[PDB]
């Protein structure tokens, strides 16, 4: 799990540098992996560590994706790119929503386990980060509203 | 009871061992999580404990394979191990190879024209004849043609020199006729010695000259007119021409010059014309030369000057030989020692002779000498040794010559029972599978005539037919063959041998199937076998349908 | 000690006791301490498994292929007190017979030279050897020798088939009493022709070298003392076995085997190493090489 996630963020910059079509696909694969991780969500401590990993650079990456989406609405289509890009956007939307309901129960439990302190910091530091920084996601939502293509709009409103 | 007590002691040790293991788990137990840096532990002991349990007092102790297995090989080895791999993929080439190179088919074939054989109603034999002459010719022409290649080098030259010192000397030494024969042997050996100490004196003495300084004058003398011309010491020049002269000049010039020097690259020249260069410790010059020069270079001096009596050359040679000492394996040297010998005494030196031998040359050498009467070799240990060496040489397809030798060697029997077994192995299957062509027929032809062809063919069939055997089991074969000519041949073989019911059925077939079955039943009277016959008939019907 | 030796040798990969090549060099039967008799095939130098004949309650010790004149037969003995004979009928590697006539472990097996018939000799750790003789069908009659060796038998080796040209066969075996007993058989029963005491401890293995047609029959033996002796008979029919020391190692020698042509001894034992030995032209044995 560590190897793939590390590769994927690096590749996304790597994907962008070479071949827009092939970078996008890698990003879509990463989004799929994230979705799988969400579905999946000693052992409890490992889960807490994973939650901590999920909650600053990773948060920024989602923001970068949102910025790409804001760029995206204006130009391209590119449906195959759009599906993968669209799918990635949907995954980003869903993970925060799916994660948040899970996260509040999850984070408190992690804190209880800590009675670990660093992971708790994620509860503290992670919470501060979440508010954002709101604008970039919001712009993407506005673009989705302008598009009126459906979907994306639900995840944006939720 | 003692063993039981030891087990009781062994059992106690095990309990102690168990306690120690428990302590290790107790002391070594490691519990880091979720993920922790790895730490040392006695992980290995647990793994060894299971093995010890599998091995399991006295019994377990003397029941643990020290390794522990040994693999025995025929032609030739196999592999084995236990163990760093337990098989080795040997790349053919490795160490031993000189023997193989020396025994390149030809070293055998050529010798076969000379050996001859006794053709009879069965296994033949061998015969002797101008053996020496034969060996001389082959070694001659062969050696000459060999003196032209492009690889190895050093090795080839050494081999050639050894062969020349072996066969050469042998022949050279196989009332004025004795005087003339010694002059002729001395004449052949002299130049021979020079050629031997060549290349070494060749480029070597070359530089020596084109270099500096003295000594060379002595080295040219070991090689005379060109040396004198290059040197051109007027008085020394006249004395130098007395070399090659066995004349009683020796003593005079010897002592007188030494005395003159005492009263007062020249004394060494005088030591040579004295004719006793090394054994005369009085001059103390040509012994001390042993560190400087090859033993072969010092031999050449003895052979060339030792003295006019044409036997004294060999004398002094043997001398300097048994003389050297620094602080055995020189082949070319050991041939000289063999040559310097006389005969008889067979009971010791005949005994290192085996050392030397231990391949094909040694065999041929002993055989010619024994047959010729010059050296009656003997007999069974020497033959055992030749037999494995010849078999090692077959491995790569040396079988026919070895078989012939085995037949001739005997003796007078028992060997045949072994040679026949070897032939059977040779054609058990692979013989029948590798011979399935034209390569087998020639080999079969080559071996001394015997009715061994049917025997080899039959073995091949068994591994993988009835007609070949002719040239219960037969019934089974008939059932499989529920082609026609072969079946007829099998029937003929059965008749020759004379299942009776089956034979009757076969006769009926030769003369329908149901009638044959009835005949078989009648034969049985005067059934699983019947069922088998029915199955064979069904198979035949299937074949007909196909 | 033994524990120290075990510590020194961790074992890179699982281990096996004995493993013998087939006649014709096609197959390679093996056995290990896991009770499993694996038959591999070696076509072109590559090892390929064909069957895992499982069936022993204890670790299999030694293994021996029968002569191909009787079809394809392989026999293996074990610490379970039993000996198994596996036949082959079209790839049908089934056991056609099983023998359980010894009360303690069976250290070794060996097949009589193919002329004598299909005789299998077997030495137990009870101190008894059981020999199985083949008849017409699946019956096997046993000729048992009780109290052959004092505290048990480790090695069994057949004398080469020597034509009297009315046939006499001699077999010599080693055991844990230090004695290398030879054996003589008449009408049926086997009697000890002679004892050979030169070892100072348990005889491990005893190999009767194949005669190169040569009448100077030799036998090799190795023991817990760490000595290897090459006992010799100077002539036919003279009850003189004169032992000669090959070498002594500070550690035990486990196994000894004769190479066919040159009479090279493969000495397995001591330091996990196996040595190769040839008798020189001088009668002293020398080590050719380290494997």
Residue numbers in the entry:
A (entry chain A): 733 to 773, 794 to 807, 810 to 869, 873 to 915
B (entry chain G): 213 to 268, 271 to 296, 298 to 300, 303 to 391, 399 to 447, 450 to 458, 462 to 493, 501 to 563, ...
C (entry chain H): 1 to 165, 177 to 302
Sentences from the paper on this structure:
The nuclear pore complex (NPC) is the only route of bidirectional cargo transport between the cytoplasm and the nucleus in a eukaryotic cell. Along the cylindrical axis from the cytoplasmic side, an NPC consists of CFs, a CR, an inner ring (IR), a nuclear ring (NR) and a nuclear basket (NB). In this study, we report the cryo-EM structure of the CR from X. laevis NPC through single particle analysis (SPA).
In this study, we report the SPA-based cryo-EM structure of the entire CR subunit at 8.0 Å resolution and the SPA-base cryo-EM reconstructions of three overlapping regions at average resolutions between 5.5 and 7.9 Å. The final average resolutions are 5.5 Å for the Core region, 7.1 Å for the Nup358-containing region, and 7.9 Å for the Nup214-containing region. Notably, the assigned top and bottom faces of the Nup43 β-propeller (convention of Wall et al.) are opposite of those proposed for the human Nup43.12,13 Two copies of the Y complex are present in each CR subunit and are named inner and outer Y complexes relative to the center of the NPC. The inner and outer Y complexes within each subunit pair up in the same head-to-tail fashion; eight pairs of the Y complexes interact with each other to form a closed ring scaffold. For each of the two Y complexes within the same CR subunit, the stem is sandwiched by a pair of the Clamps, suggesting a stabilizing role. The EM density for Nup205 or Nup188 was assigned to two molecules of Nup205, not Nup188 as previously proposed. The two molecules, named outer Nup205 and inner Nup205, interact with the short arms of the outer and inner Y complexes, respectively. Outer Nup205 also associates with the stem of the inner Y complex from the adjacent CR subunit.
